[PDB]
Design an enzyme around this catalytic site. Sequence first.
Site, PDB file in Angstrom:
ATOM      1  N   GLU A 150       0.843  -1.200   0.000  1.00 58.25           N
ATOM      2  CA  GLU A 150       0.000   0.000   0.000  1.00 58.25           C
ATOM      3  C   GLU A 150       0.878   1.250   0.000  1.00 58.25           C
ATOM      4  O   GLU A 150       0.750   2.115   0.876  1.00 58.25           O
ATOM      5  CB  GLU A 150      -0.938   0.003   1.211  1.00 58.25           C
ATOM      6  N   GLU A 274      -6.646  -7.784  -0.996  1.00 57.20           N
ATOM      7  CA  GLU A 274      -7.247  -7.714   0.333  1.00 57.20           C
ATOM      8  C   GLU A 274      -8.677  -7.185   0.213  1.00 57.20           C
ATOM      9  O   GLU A 274      -8.912  -6.193  -0.486  1.00 57.20           O
ATOM     10  CB  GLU A 274      -6.462  -6.783   1.285  1.00 57.20           C
TER      11      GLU A 274
END
Length: 348
Positions: A150, A274
């Site tokens: 991320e 995710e």
Amino acid sequence: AASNMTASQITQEMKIGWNLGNTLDAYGGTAKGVATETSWGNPKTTKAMIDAVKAKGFNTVRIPTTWFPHLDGSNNIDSAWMARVKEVVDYCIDNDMYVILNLHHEEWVDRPDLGSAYNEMQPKFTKIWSQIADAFKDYDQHLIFESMNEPRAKGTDHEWWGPQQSEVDTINKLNQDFVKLIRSSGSANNKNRLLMIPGYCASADQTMFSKIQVPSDNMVAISIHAYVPYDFTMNTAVSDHSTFSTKYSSSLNQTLESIRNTFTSKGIPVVIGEFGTSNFGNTEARVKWAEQYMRTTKEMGIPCVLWDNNVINAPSSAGECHGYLNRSNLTWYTESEPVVNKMMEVLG
């Protein structure tokens, strides 16, 4: 010898995935060496745990891995740490599953100065990926590499929205460096391996994922994190999570259709690495969310990888209760098992 599989064949066979959360990604304690694995309260991973994940119907395991605590001053990876990562990979590959291996909570990636840090980052990034590519050079296409998790300007007013052009540039350049490096490996397995690359903060918002530079490579997929809609899935500032209402169904559909518009309708592979919902004592609402999410993504051909951190109760962090497999006794948590069951029902 079997010939190579295409990206489309791989994403189909992946089916649905499970993340080994809060495990090899854990960092920050006083624990050193392989003991970081248990430093956020989870037990040492065993093959019996992965066996149970496969038995429930998953065919992919993502192994989020935080590497910086295991590097020396020259960025050499500690050999006992590499061996443990490989041991956990093998629990999954030996079960005929797909595996996604990444770089996760890297303090030298998730940083407020990301937009100025390319020249500092590049040698460290390439030395780390060179070592991983060599350690796994004889693994077939069941093993997938993911460049970063991320990447974002952590701590700034734009950590999760509205990046600077400098930050977009750093991420895009490192993703190109990664694909070029893997394809330059002497191993034919690495030359044919499926690779995943994220955009800014792994965003599921089109304003950010539309700025990803797609490498000119036919074995690359875009990775997105999509815990959407956030006000339902996890936001503790919202009091009521008891109902998956029409407004939340609208929001979810809008997000998923924007991914189809930008990527899959144009032939670009996508993996949702995710997704999930926290346990707010709202099982029926989470089941309705899962039915819509999986029905839509199944038809789009997007495999989704559930976040499982083995936390079923957390009164001071009620948005982080992402447990499904009770790892201590190889049962499924009663409050959250119906959510997984709905996912497997849709995919059947």
